[model samples]
Target: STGSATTTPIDSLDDAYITPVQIGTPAQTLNLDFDTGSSDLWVFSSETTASEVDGQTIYTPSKSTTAKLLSGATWSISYGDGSSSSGDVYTDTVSVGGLTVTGQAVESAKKVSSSFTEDSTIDGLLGLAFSTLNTVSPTQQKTFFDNAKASLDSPVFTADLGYHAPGTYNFGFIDTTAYTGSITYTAVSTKQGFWEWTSTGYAVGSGTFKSTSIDGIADTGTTLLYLPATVVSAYWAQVSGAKSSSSVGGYVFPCSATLPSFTFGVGSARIVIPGDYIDFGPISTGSSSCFGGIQSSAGIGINIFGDVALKAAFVVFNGATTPTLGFASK
Candidate 1:
């Protein structure tokens, strides 16, 4: 993950989601989020009126003496989930962990919908993903990694997504200490704007579903893993006394016994998902019959391995050198 610049102190947001750094005599603070789907840095501002700002965080430009607007350029972005936002542009001396990058392009949306308003922790998002989905393109497009790439020791950015706990995701270095075994590399194919690939098969305990050799894409943007009905049902069959319940979106089983371990193979690397992830939150359907993991999303897409799958391994998106995804132990 050494595809970007390496600066001193490695700026990161604390529990309050504020990037604390020492500038000259005093320490400065900023806000940032680690996103892989898009390449851009955004923050909230006081210049935005209440009518124009809805669910997004509003940053106080007056709070920081170094904050600067990017000539009031307009910007817009749309996501696959049918959500979109439009706003003005700004530039500031953005800092992460302890590292500082000056003249960083950021989006300050004045009109955001309710979809993005739920999370009130941080003020902005720091996209470390690919550059294809950049909004500041054509004339001048800058990414957090793009700007940091020149300052990092090596041109790399690695993310370590922590599930139930807060994990570390770095921009310039790959924490080799986080993994156990060797890393596996899979060449990326240009299907959509994202880097996608095919799955060979998936297994749970003794049950296995050999792929018709059908293709599937690996997306960090997607939150859940979607598979064909037949494939999902086949794997669920192996769960000890697994029963379907219609409580929490359907896929639930009795908790009287332990569920089988499921493993999925992407190329040569075989990744496993613990039974607990499948169970998710134990939902009660009355009469002691509870629903576990294995929900119904039949026609959603072919097969999508989201955070649940990625959390089990260290995923490396090699956009700086080659179009590939590398996996290692977590």
Candidate 2:
């Protein structure tokens, strides 16, 4: 039961990538974000109000002969950016990259925030994090990856997210051709139900990498890389005219600034984030001012290696006695 999926960045927003998924009998297909930050498969459905749906696609569980409602169950989840979804629950055959899981818990979203309702193309989210993060009320549900793992030959999945291009997510085994050099391994700490790890240090533009530790999480759902305020300040200080923009949020710099490469370490492995990637599109609603890809964690207290950072290397989400992360340059 090995499988893989192709994901593409949404409109070059760099916010997230979407992969195709099939649910229930008759195979109703939808594009979903394979989120590694949370553990709940939620979708826009017939249960959602017409006003909330806008131009989004809807999933009708009744159409699938195998769709079974989970009586007295419901779910609600919120992200760091204030995006949210809530709805009733159902059990159905969920499939991704040709891998199928019978009786997979599916949350039918009767309610969604503007972030989701606005993105008409994204029909749902396929959470790939640990099952402990599931938000189902009364009884928690296993994630699609967790539900399909035992059937997999090797119980592993790899995320090959790309920038402005299609990338493949390989399951059951690693694809050696996707990366170069060597894969670096790090023991993951899932204390928070997240794939969290500590980087040994970081540097700016080949400048001396500070020999200090920073705790961080690898999150596919988040669009930007976040670090401690002190670290963000240190990096931006190297770029002239880069400052926090009250209008656009996050740090904004002139698009033409000679930005430096930012690097972070995973044990002995050091992954560098390019300067161009740091300049995340425009600042104002419509302006030449460019927003920075790196920002302060501040109140969140946890650093996040979002899409900008993850795309720098090949990532392996290994399920084991202690789930770990394997990284290698692409």
Candidate 3:
């Protein structure tokens, strides 16, 4: 067994990345947001809705005692901007970083969509993807990395996604000092429960690679880096004063442009990404237009790679029984 945690960054344009979870039985810590793009470990509880609670951090499954209520399960979900949440289903004892997992289903929140009651920097979400994309119900629930993947001593989980400092999420192994060269692995198609893959092309800064393959997904709960619209119009056509407005929703630019870096490919690795990490900032305070971190995935039909391409490397996911997705360069 293993576990590691420490992720932080829910603001200043790093946008979403939380961590500290501990869950039931006199514990309750709750800072969660781990999300490798949706599976649903949900939260914000005490059954949510007190007019959609607001400063978040809820989750009092009647003060834990190993909280049990699974009874009729239930769940709902909806995102990619539509924002949503739903409820019921308990089980308990979650932990992370200290590893635990005893029955873990969690998911409480009975209603929440005011963009999750005004964000308040996240208080629920830990879903390292795949348990066939969870979302409770008459059953279907295991994903706190598949219930700690057989007591983990190797079913893998890496994700070192930092940009403004803190990042890590270990579990099992692979911390070659948190990355730098030699990892590249690939092959992940979880048949759409995502962590999907297939990208043998892309380049924009030092140019010429575009061999073209690019399917996507590896979304640490997405925060920009969607592609294809011809590689987001060839990386905002080399910046300058970029544009794709619609009243400023994507591809904005000019927070002092000069941008450029962004590479991608894995199997001969590429990974680059820094041009100020696509300058995703300045869309407001003293706004000289910024907002970009790469985008386009034409109406979101897949292509995500988010957290601006997982903070430019060190990914791994790999849950055995025929799964894979590694990447390196730190």
Candidate 4:
């Protein structure tokens, strides 16, 4: 049977979305970051060193009657944000919302990086990308969606992430009622295991839409909209108090500065991000300075259409022969 789940924003606009996922036989539930950027189902486990795991709950494979070790199987994953985790593999029943897949490869984290330890709210990450990207050694592991897709009436899922309220994620079903307007379709190239697409062009507040192709990935795991250095500079220029600060690693501006909407082009469809969302909360604790949600896509090769940008639209990740991305107003 098909399934659907809702995702709740952990904190502010740029923070990741958290959802419940059940693992093992008796259903050891854990909060996970449902990420579309990468593929790898990993969780903090008993094998994790106590010092490395902060407030996150650990998964106990031994406690689950159905958990089994994939002999010599190990996994390690690293995110663009520099957060990482690595550990052994156990096959078990993993469920999300109304869908359940038996013999799913569940990676248990034995080691975690500092960034993960600092985030107490997230127990682990559930990869929604293509299963080919799974990091399990020797034998590749399929993502939960991959295993459950065949049974679905419609092999598709949609992501409706928001800033303040709860957002829903659908599996094998599309809830058109969740959004408005016709969903704009774009051809997706998934050679990299990501929902990578090219935008026809874009414009800034009230400006004429331009004609230029911008390649980017629809990454739910990323917080900011990463574009070329020139594009980032162009958007920030419209803000009176905005400036790039190397000390802060990105652009920063006055918390009170009035900003303009940023628009993105997807073929004929234009998705606009509100001005207020551009201000990504505060840069630091007790500071009046705020971080710019749009940044330069330098090291990561392709630009990233992160949550700050995607939250402005209702996204449909079409699981077609040639997968397409459909975006519409929320």
Candidate 5:
């Protein structure tokens, strides 16, 4: 079986991306972030604190005929940004894009960080990364993809994230029409439970391509592109009036400055990111200073090819016994 769904940016800045997901027998729908950086299919639920339940759609297991509590099972997950959510677990029929998975583990949030409660656009997160990263205690549960992989015509999924537009998340088969040219393949290491791979190198604007190896993860959940400090410095050095601003916690430059394009390598293939994507958005409303979408990964430990970079190409997370990743320009 195969299924596909449309994913859209939540805001003009593309702060995050979300896709519709259905849960329960009656099928309550909610917009969820398909996160590749972590493993835990959690949602806002009736169990959540009333104060934390802003405008998000809550999943009420009581209404679902298939819902069953996983007694004593609990889950807790934290992100790099310090935001987190945790609660008990339940099994229910979950559907994504028409692909259905029976007895899928659904973590219900009893407590959420202030950052999550403030974002009314996202109801929960559907983790697409490896199941090994699942936070469920005692017996960790498989991810939605893991449960659906065997039934899929092909044990693979593709991410076609868009820039200020709607894109797609496809399962079972790759959409040949979604990308241009052939895809560049790379071996993926699941040791860290991420779609971890190494890029050939990078170049700023039309400058010479650096013949070096840079390791990073293709993370759709992350909002910006993060690279090594040296690479980030090299890219920002080309922009006039650019500075590593302390107040903003990242690099900021004059909005009027002419920004240069960024290029990263995948084997022999080179994907170019337009300068406009790097400009990100104004640091403050109506401010002349803008935050850079490409930031240093010095504090992050590992480089991340987030939405800023993922939107530049088509991405494939192939679920082989030994997994691999594919990238193609669109």
Candidate 6:
């Protein structure tokens, strides 16, 4: 059977987010963000001040019949975007759909910066990225997967982004009901934090435009799609009368004609990104111009293909089945 559907709010901070789910019996629920970039589960608590937990949903340990503290082991986390939150540690019985994970590691922040304290929509984040990045130790921490892995048939997790309004993002095991095809697997690099890869080349407008070698990383934490400067310039050059403008902190171009379909080749996998994504919104800086999904990361070091690219295809992070990544079409 396919797993259940769950929804988490994307916080106003844009960095920290969370969703609500029921725990075992007695109608218990905890708020958590659905994160694919990191593997950990944390939530705010009543111990946090009203100012610190203002925008987030603080889990009331007093309300939950099952809750435990982590002996005041302070913890804090900072993202690549300079957003961070810190607090004491706590353990609680967390749940999603019909699954309940007991003794789960949770972070109860005493002090949250405006970036996090301002977001009232989200309570906390649930990291579903990979086990290698698990923050909770076996003896100390417990995750949704660590507890519920046995309930899953293939021990696999997949995410399907929306094609249009109100898209669906499902987790906790591969649901064949949402997709049709054999899973394509890619060996994962034993790296540190990021899910990095080497790109073979790129395809534009259904044609192979360039053969430039590039290294790529798939980051769910990042909302903007970043690419090498030369690649971005080369891409815009194809658009007739496409001129570079300073808007949206990246390249902006006038909408003259239909943009071509762009695809990134990762090893043997060809991940195609649709054109609609490029025209999502007007360039923040330029008039009579629409922003392309591809942004300039000239000296940013690593090239990142964010959610804009993943939204076009169904992604399967096959951490449970094997030490590899998987992709499929929905």
Q: Which ten residues in a row have the lowest lDDT in candidate 4?
A: 5-14
User: Whose TM-score is greatest here?
Assistant: 5
Prediction RMSDs, each to the true structure:
5.6, 1.1, 14.9, 1.2, 0.6, 3.8
Model 3 CA lDDT for position 186 = 84
Quote the positional error of residue 102 for candidate 4 in Å.
Answer: 0.8
lDDT per residue, candidate 2, 1-330, as tens digits? 699889988876667788989997999988999889999999999999888997777889999999999999999999988889899999999888888899999999999998888898799998988899999999999998888889998888999888768898888889999999899989889889999888888998979978898889889988889999989999999998889876666798887787899998878889988887777777657787888899999867789989989988899999877789999998
> Could you tell me the lDDT of residue 256 within candidate 1?
64
Model 3, residue 48: what's the lDDT?
81
Candidate 5: give the clashing pairs: none
Candidate 5 lDDT tens digits, 1-330: 998999999999989999999999899998999999998999999999999989999999999999999999999999989999999999999998999999999999999999999999999999999999999998999999999999999999999988889999999999999999999999999999999999999999999999899999999999999999999999999999999988899999999998999999999999999998877778889999999999999998999999999999999999989899999999
lDDT of 6 by residue, 1-330 (tens): 235544432532123234466542355566655666666666666777676766555667766666666774666667655767666666776666555667666666666667667666766667665556765433344456656677666565565655443334444566667665655666665476445656677877767646666776666556667888777877777777666665456656676556767777655667777666665455443557766667777746678767677666677766554456676665
| Cα lDDT tens digits for candidate 1, 50-96 | 66444544665555576666674777777655656667776666656
- Quick one: how many clashes does candidate 1 have? 32
Instruction: Select the stronger candidate by lDDT from 4 and 6.
Output: 4
Candidate 1 local Cα displacement, residue 257, angstroms: 6.6
User: Residue-wise lDDT of candidate 4 within 262-302, one digit each (tens)?
Assistant: 99998888899998877787887889998888889986788
Error of 1 at 113 (Å): 1.6
Worst 10 residues of 3 by lDDT: 248-257
**Candidate 1: deviation at residue 167, Å?**
1.0
TM-score to true structure, per model: 0.76, 0.97, 0.35, 0.97, 0.99, 0.81
TM-score of 1: 0.76
Evaluated with lDDT, which candidate comes out highest?
5
- The CA lDDT of each predicted structure is 0.58, 0.88, 0.85, 0.87, 0.94, 0.62
| True-structure lDDT of candidate 6 | 0.62
Q: Is candidate 2 or candidate 5 better by TM-score?
A: 5
Give the worst 10-residue stretch by lDDT in candidate 6. 8-17
